[PDB]
């Protein structure tokens, strides 16, 4: 299984086994069941098991490939493989796209961008007017929406990111190479 | 010349929800405070004000391009805080000031940020 996992991901056997040590920590913090549930995930990211956040919900949801409400070790390793420095960049691009498509519409809707921008402000404890938020949403959206049709599609997103590669900066954990030593 | 442009998609990458570095922490005893604010004042003026307050608080400051590096001059280790501050234009008259800890103790950092903001309450926007 560590050998099977290592063969479907950029990780080696020794790396998968190192990640298992981490998973054991993350998955045992509230209910020790070899699974990570929403509250255990909020605890690992925020050090507050009760802190709700749109982006963490989106990450959690994408990690949960089995759509069963939890992250098993297999789900955990397969998804983290995408954050490896050596994962193909197009996988990184499509993972971010999936995160931002809040309600699985197949596009990044304009109101989905807006909801994200509001959540970011809320998260940061910043207070801005509706008009100001609109200017911010509009500038980004008109630029990504190449074809001028009112939605953002995968190919438009791919081109947008090719023009600003730092948009997927979060999509690399540049020390998934140094996990053995950790 | 001005601060780097940060469009809405760039801004959202700031979220603690999207950055999974925290899962790899070994020791974390404390909860992250939000250390960011927005302002409408001219960027060069934001910088000068941040430099002035920091100097009076016992920090050595070095600015390159709307990015400032602050180092504590205290002779006592807990006070040897390192901090980086960058300004980004998020909208034509709206600038975000993002404050980050480069080194030092979290609780000392939080104390610092609180004190900084109380000295700068004028430049901070609603
Ligand atoms: Ca669990
Ligand atoms: Ca489009």
Swiss-Prot record, chain A:
Keyword annotations of the record: Cell membrane, Cytoplasm, Lipoprotein, Manganese, Membrane, Myristate, Nucleus, Phosphoprotein, Repeat
One BP term from GO: calcium-mediated signaling
Site label Involved in dimerization, positions: 124
PTM per Swiss-Prot/TrEMBL: Both N-myristoylation and calcium-mediated conformational changes are essential for its function. Phosphorylated by CIPK6 and CIPK24.
Biological function: Acts as a calcium sensor involved in the regulatory pathway for the control of intracellular Na(+) and K(+) homeostasis and salt tolerance. Binding of a CBL protein to the regulatory NAF domain of a CIPK serine-threonine protein kinase lead to the activation of the kinase in a calcium-dependent manner. Operates in synergy with CIPK24/SOS2 to activate the plasma membrane Na(+)/H(+) antiporter SOS1. Involved in salt stress responses by mediating calcium-dependent microfilament reorganization.
Subunit (UniProt): Interacts with CIPK24/SOS2, CIPK6/SIP3, CIPK10/SIP1, CIPK11/SIP4 and CIPK15/SIP2. Homodimer, mediated by calcium-binding. Binds to ABCG36.
Name this protein carries in UniProt: Calcineurin B-like protein 4
Gene source species: Arabidopsis thaliana (Mouse-ear cress)
Residues of the full protein shown: 21 to 202 of 222
From Swiss-Prot, chain B:
Domain NAF: 1-25
Compartments it resides in: Cytoplasm; Nucleus
Modification comment: Autophosphorylated.
Induction: Up-regulated in roots by salt stress.
Segments of this protein annotated with the region PPI: 32-61
Residue stretches in coiled coil: none
Function noted in UniProt: Involved in the regulatory pathway for the control of intracellular Na(+) and K(+) homeostasis and salt tolerance. Activates the vacuolar H(+)/Ca(2+) antiporter CAX1 and operates in synergy with CBL4/SOS3 to activate the plasma membrane Na(+)/H(+) antiporter SOS1. CIPK serine-threonine protein kinases interact with CBL proteins. Binding of a CBL protein to the regulatory NAF domain of CIPK protein lead to the activation of the kinase in a calcium-dependent manner. Phosphorylates CBL1, CBL4 and CBL10.
Subunit structure: Interacts with CBL1, CBL2, CBL4/SOS3, CBL5, CBL9, CBL10 and with the protein phosphatase 2C ABI2.
UniProt remark on domains: The activation loop within the kinase domain is the target of phosphorylation/activation by upstream protein kinases. The PPI motif mediates the interaction with the ABI (abscisic acid-insensitive) phosphatases. The C-terminal part (309-446) of the protein is required for the phosphorylation of CBL, but is not involved in autophosphorylation.
Similarity remark: Belongs to the protein kinase superfamily. CAMK Ser/Thr protein kinase family. SNF1 subfamily.
Protein's recorded name: CBL-interacting serine/threonine-protein kinase 24
Source organism of the structure: Arabidopsis thaliana
Gene name per UniProt: CIPK24
């Amino acid at each position: 299984d560590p050998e099977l996992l290592a063969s479907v991901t950029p990780f080696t056997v020794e790396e998968v086994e190192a990640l298992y040590e981490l998973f054991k920590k993350l998955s045992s913090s509230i209910i020790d069941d070899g699974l990570i549930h929403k509250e255990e995930f909020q605890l690992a990211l925020f050090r507050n098991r009760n802190r709700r956040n749109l982006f963490a919900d989106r990450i959690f949801d994408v990690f949960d490939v089995k759509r069963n409400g939890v992250i098993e070790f297999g789900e955990f390793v397969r998804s983290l493989g995408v954050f490896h420095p050596s994962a193909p960049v197009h996988e990184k691009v499509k993972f971010a796209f999936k995160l931002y498509d809040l309600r699985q519409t197949g596009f990044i809707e304009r109101e989905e961008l807006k909801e994200m921008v509001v959540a970011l402000l809320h998260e940061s404890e910043l207070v801005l007017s509706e008009d100001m938020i609109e200017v911010m949403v509009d500038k980004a959206f008109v630029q990504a929406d190449r074809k001028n049709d009112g939605k953002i599609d995968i190919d438009e997103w791919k081109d947008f990111v090719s023009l600003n590669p730092s948009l997927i900066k979060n999509m690399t954990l540049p020390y998934l190479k140094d996990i053995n030593r950790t | 010349e001005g601060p780097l442009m940060m469009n809405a998609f760039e801004m959202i990458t700031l979220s603690q929800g999207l950055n999974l570095s925290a899962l790899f922490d070994r020791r974390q005893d404390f909860v992250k405070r939000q250390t960011r604010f927005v302002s409408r004042r001219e960027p060069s003026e934001i910088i000068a004000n941040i430099e002035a307050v920091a100097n009076s608080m016992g920090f050595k400051s070095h600015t390159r391009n709307f990015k400032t590096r602050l180092e504590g001059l205290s002779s006592i280790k807990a006070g040897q805080l390192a901090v980086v501050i960058e300004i980004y234009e998020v909208a034509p008259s709206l600038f975000m000031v993002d404050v980050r800890k480069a080194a030092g103790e979290t609780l000392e950092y939080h104390k610092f940020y609180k004190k900084l903001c109380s000295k700068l309450e004028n430049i901070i926007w609603r």
